[PDB]
Design a protein that fits this description.
The structure is a homotrimer.
Chain A (H helix, E strand, L loop, with lengths): L1 E6 L10 H13 L7 E5 L3 E4 L7 E7 L5 H19 L6 E7 L5 E3 L2 E2 L2
Parallel strand pairs in A: 1-2, 4-5
Antiparallel strand pairs in A: 1-4, 6-7
Helix pairs in contact in A: 1-2
The structure holds phenylmethylsulfonyl fluoride (3 copies).
PDB class: isomerase
Keywords: covalent modification, covalent inhibition, Cytokine, Inflammatory response, Isomerase, Phosphoprotein
Assembly: trimeric
Chain lengths: ~110, ~110, ~110
């Protein structure tokens, strides 16, 4: 699976260990081995949420399976939790798009997962 | 809903009120309250359209509902209009990906919209 | 169609001609006229793959049609080949999300492709 967070929070406010913590926590949350987890953080963005430029984040989680009503609620609690504690972003200023990708539609290592 | 514009236009050429205008125009266009609108502008990008590095933009609009054939035509006229007026990007050098998201697949405020 | 690559490889390591090569090769591979191909490269990203910050990439290819099991395998071989040769990124550290977009959901030139 892969997780991306885009935020207006400045690079200096992203703590050491953040990508590692996302990697570990997402492995645990999704049940994908950590070797598979891709994470990507994009600070210093020009973004607004409700017309306000206070800290916010626009994120995505793509996975082959492990995506669903209850699971996505759980991921959102985990991830908003991390963004609040680590980046000081209010959970109500975070959106996370979830994508259940078909294996045929995910490329890797010169091929796809199909 | 959330709107993202990625462009090779330089940051200095993005007008100061651009995020606020997008927010207001999208609230009007989608009928969603302005409090929910997220907007994200990413200038200075290394991109090409048809092999040319003249101004261009790659955009997305995600919404829970309010996505469809006629609506997307209307959004495309509105958004190309704004990109042309404010960023001086030709409409034929703009792509906008529209996504009709399920409420269960949009995380917000420690949960999802489901 | 449109191709985006986000990578932690630094800007200076992206060779001259890279976007043109992607344009040409994607025209050949997808069959789409070169004039319609959009390409976007985002270097210097803060990312990890399997907990490691060695070179990696997260990519996407959106197309109206020309997406499927065999086709995506072919795209993946092409694109991982290019990322390896040009950016020195190992194929097993690349993910590519493939999207078969409905024409009504792709805006261009004040309207959509529908
Ligand atoms: S993960 O193990 O689910 C692999 C993956 C899935 C979807 C997009 C990118 C990577
Ligand atoms: S909007 O009010 O439609 C909320 C939203 C929908 C989809 C993605 C992100 C945010
Ligand atoms: S391409 O010729 O397929 C046009 C396109 C399709 C999907 C997204 C963006 C552009």
């Amino acid at each position: 699976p892969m997780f991306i967070v885009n935020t207006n929070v400045p690079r200096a406010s992203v703590p050491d260990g953040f990508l590692s913590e996302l990697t570990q926590q997402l492995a645990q949350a999704t049940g994908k081995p950590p070797q598979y987890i891709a994470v990507h953080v994009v600070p210093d963005q020009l973004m607004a949420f409700g017309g306000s430029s206070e800290p916010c984040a626009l994120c995505s989680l793509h996975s082959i399976g492990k995506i669903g009503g209850a699971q996505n609620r759980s991921y959102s609690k985990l991830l908003c939790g991390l963004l609040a504690e680590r980046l000081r972003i209010s959970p109500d200023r975070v959106y996370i798009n979830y994508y259940d990708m078909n294996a045929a539609n995910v490329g890797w290592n010169n091929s796809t997962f199909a």
